[PDB]
Amino acid sequence: MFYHISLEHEILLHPRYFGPNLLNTVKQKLFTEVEGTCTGKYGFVIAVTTIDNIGAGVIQPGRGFVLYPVKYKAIVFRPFKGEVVDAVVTQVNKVGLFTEIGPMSCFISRHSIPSEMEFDPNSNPPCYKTMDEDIVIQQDDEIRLKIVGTRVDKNDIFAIGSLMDDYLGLV
Amino acid sequence: VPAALKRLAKYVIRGFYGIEHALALDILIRNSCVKEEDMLELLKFDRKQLRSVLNNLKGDKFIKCRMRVETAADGKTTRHNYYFINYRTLVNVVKYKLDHMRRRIETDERDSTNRASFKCPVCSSTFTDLEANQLFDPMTGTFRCTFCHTEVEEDESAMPKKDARTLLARFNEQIEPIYALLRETED
Amino acid sequence: EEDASQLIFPKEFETAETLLNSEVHMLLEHRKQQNESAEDEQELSEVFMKTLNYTARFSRFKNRETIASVRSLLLQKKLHKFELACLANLCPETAEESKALIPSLEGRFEDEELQQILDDIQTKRSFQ
Ligand SMILES: [Zn+2]
């Protein structure tokens, strides 16, 4: 779910960046550091809505850097276990289905996929279809999946999609 | 001393214990209280062997012991160990051995779930199903490990789990006859 | 420890405000407008583009006034902040469908009243 929260970050500013525009560099440096980095506690960070306040810059003894604590408001998305969220299928494979939800990517194991669904290797575009063809799931389609679990590693978060529950899959 | 308690004590001792324990219980069945020395002469067992058996019988509290100290005819102190069966304490301990085994079914089942479903045989390192996707290279089209540069197979991890399930239903058969035995405790 | 269905969230996700996809798109669009200004500045990361496309795809309201009107009406109804985002995002057509998706929603209001709330969102929703 998309959440707008205030985050605490520490910026170590090199002495070369001192002088005029010091705060501007701190603000600019904050965007580069935060953007493209994700943490399990708060999830992926998209962009910084605003900077609440720049704290006092404590000079590091001996190191020469100045540690600037920054309070900034940014919007983050985190996968919640037992939650249904719309997803877009990127690649289709017999082993499993890969789907992307914004920056977050979810992987669907074959076991979690409903039994009636079967891989369609014969078709040029890989897809899952039923015997009666009532429901067809292929690449680049909006589907609903349940987040069975979340694992975070190397500052990257990903979930497991299960279509066993009702009101799931392509609608 | 109702005969139900006497009958069961023989049944349980002959089931989970060797003939040595059963023979000792027979002496205590015939006589409510018997000296340790008297039992040794009757059974002709070794001193260490009898003590170990008695200690085991004391471990499960099937029979209790009391120490009597007196002066012998020649003046030397005599310390005789008198062993007697305590049915009231026996029933509680033997009953405890039921629920543990009955509840042991759940504990054993958890052991199988611990084993990982996905494993890498070439590198002999368990592979998490999720970590496989990150380790999996989309260009290659199949999951692989960079360090050993070889394909992975999770079929091997499947076989051990199936066997353990048979060990469970097979486990229950052991405690089925004993369930009938312990019904004599309540009667 | 945290379950959306059980309305259980960590201490951090207590005062957090949930923004709708349409509202999220508006803020992201403002960032894009600021991106054009102050030339030679840092280019927006691909993650920003991914979210901007996602919110735009699911945008249930293409008019700023409609989004405000929906929020104002939803404010009157005593609904949890997290549930409001789901209500305005999924936009279930039937009351029963909404209840099934969110087990915690059961008992909050009457079934007849629940259906009316969903129907109102449809009227504000713009179909293209
Ligand atoms: Zn390997």
Swiss-Prot record, chain B:
Residues 5-95 form the HTH TFE/IIEalpha-type domain. It comes from the Eukaryota. A zinc finger (C4-type) spans 120-148. Zn(2+) binds at residues 120, 123, 145, 148. Transmembrane segments: none annotated. Tetramer of two alpha and two beta chains. Interacts with TAF6/TAFII80. Interacts with ATF7IP. Interacts with SND1. Part of TBP-based Pol II pre-initiation complex (PIC), in which Pol II core assembles with general transcription factors and other specific initiation factors including GTF2E1, GTF2E2, GTF2F1, GTF2F2, TCEA1, ERCC2, ERCC3, GTF2H2, GTF2H3, GTF2H4, GTF2H5, GTF2A1, GTF2A2, GTF2B and TBP; this large multi-subunit PIC complex mediates DNA unwinding and targets Pol II core to the transcription start site where the first phosphodiester bond forms. (Microbial infection) Interacts with varicella-zoster virus IE63 protein. This is General transcription factor IIE subunit 1.
